[PDB]
Structure formats: C-alpha cells, structure tokens
C-alpha cells in the first residue's frame, strides 16, 4: 500500500550540479534547488534534540534527522537554462529544532545535499551555496509516495 505525504514548504537551498553519474542525463554546472520541507508523517529521531546529547551521537553516526527525498524535477531560469529541483521532507518537529539551533541547521542542510547525491548519483557544490528568502522553488510541492514502513511509527497502518 502506497501512502502520500503532502509536504509543508519551509526554506530553499540553492547550489550547483558539479557532476551527474546516474542512469539519466543532466547538464553539469546547472543551478540546483532543494526544497527543505516538512510533515508530521516523516519519522523523527527517538532521542529528543538536546545539543550536548545529540552532537556526540551525530559524530558516532547514531543520530540523524530522517529525510524523505523526492525524484528531481526540471525548472528553467529566465535565459531558458535548465535547473534541477528536489524536495527534502523532514518531520515537522525537526523543522522547529533547526530554527533554534544554527549548528543543527547546518548539519541538516549537509544531510539534504547528501540525500540528493545518494538517490540520483549527482555531486553538488558545497561552496556555491546560497539560501533564497523564498519558502520553495516552483509551484505546489508535489506529494511524496511512500510505503507504509517508511511512515512515522504513529502514522503506519
């Protein structure tokens, strides 16, 4: 059974595509946008966010904010050049944690970049990075199709 997660727009990561080694063709050097968004349907860490507890767990690879990433979609800039867009959906509580702790927000941004890199075999720039003041890139964020074992425990069947 496939469930739908309708993400709530939050903020955008702007970057650059350095290389594409995946099953599909992408143009190197094109602008990349990542929509960091949220839903209460995304799993969340079992350990509540407390900086002194959690940052050592992150170093130990024992704690992470779960991310559900969409397939990429194409948009175009004003000169007609292709730009690639991904949605990275996290639990709504985790979206509030990254408001109050800038160190956690930086790590979450890195996790979102790695998530797109993993799912589509792309390499994204860590230097040519920006944070547009918009909530999302593009029109309505499309629904994420997920299996029931991917949902937050309290929202499973």
Numbering used by the authors: 28 to 184
Quote the passages of the study that discuss this structure, keeping the authors' original sentences.
The R2TP complex is found in organisms from yeast to humans, and consists of the AAA+ ATPases Rvb1 and Rvb2 (human: RUVBL1 and RUVBL2), a TPR-containing protein, Tah1 (human: Spagh or RPAP3), and Pih1 (also known as NOP17 and Pih1D1, but referred to as Pih1 henceforth; Kakihara and Houry, 2012; Te et al., 2007). Pih1 is the multipoint scaffold of the R2TP complex, coupling the Rvb1-Rvb2 hetero-dodecamer, the Hsp90 chaperone machinery (via Tah1 in yeast or Spagh/RPAP3 in metazoa), and the TTT (Tel2-Tti1-Tti2) complex implicated in activation and stabilization of PIKKs (Hurov et al., 2010; Kakihara and Houry, 2012). The biological roles ascribed to the R2TP complex are directly associated with its ability to interact with the Hsp90 chaperone system and function as an Hsp90 cochaperone (Boulon et al., 2010; Izumi et al., 2012; Takai et al., 2010). Here we present crystal structures of Hsp90-Tah1-Pih1, Hsp90-Spagh/RPAP3, and Pih1-Tel2 complexes that together define key structural links within the R2TP core in yeast and in animals and reveal how R2TP connects the Hsp90 chaperone system to the TTT complex involved in PIKK activation.
Interaction with Tel2 involves the N-terminal segment of Pih1 (Horejsí et al., 2010), which contains a conserved region of unknown structure (henceforth, PIH domain). We also obtained crystals of an essentially identical region of budding yeast Pih128–184 and determined the structure of this with molecular replacement. The PIH domain consists of a twisted five-stranded β sheet with one face traversed by a helix-turn-helix segment connecting strands 4 and 5, and the other face traversed by a coil segment extending from the end of β strand 5. An additional α helix connecting strands 2 and 3 projects from the end of the sheet and packs against the larger of the other two helices.
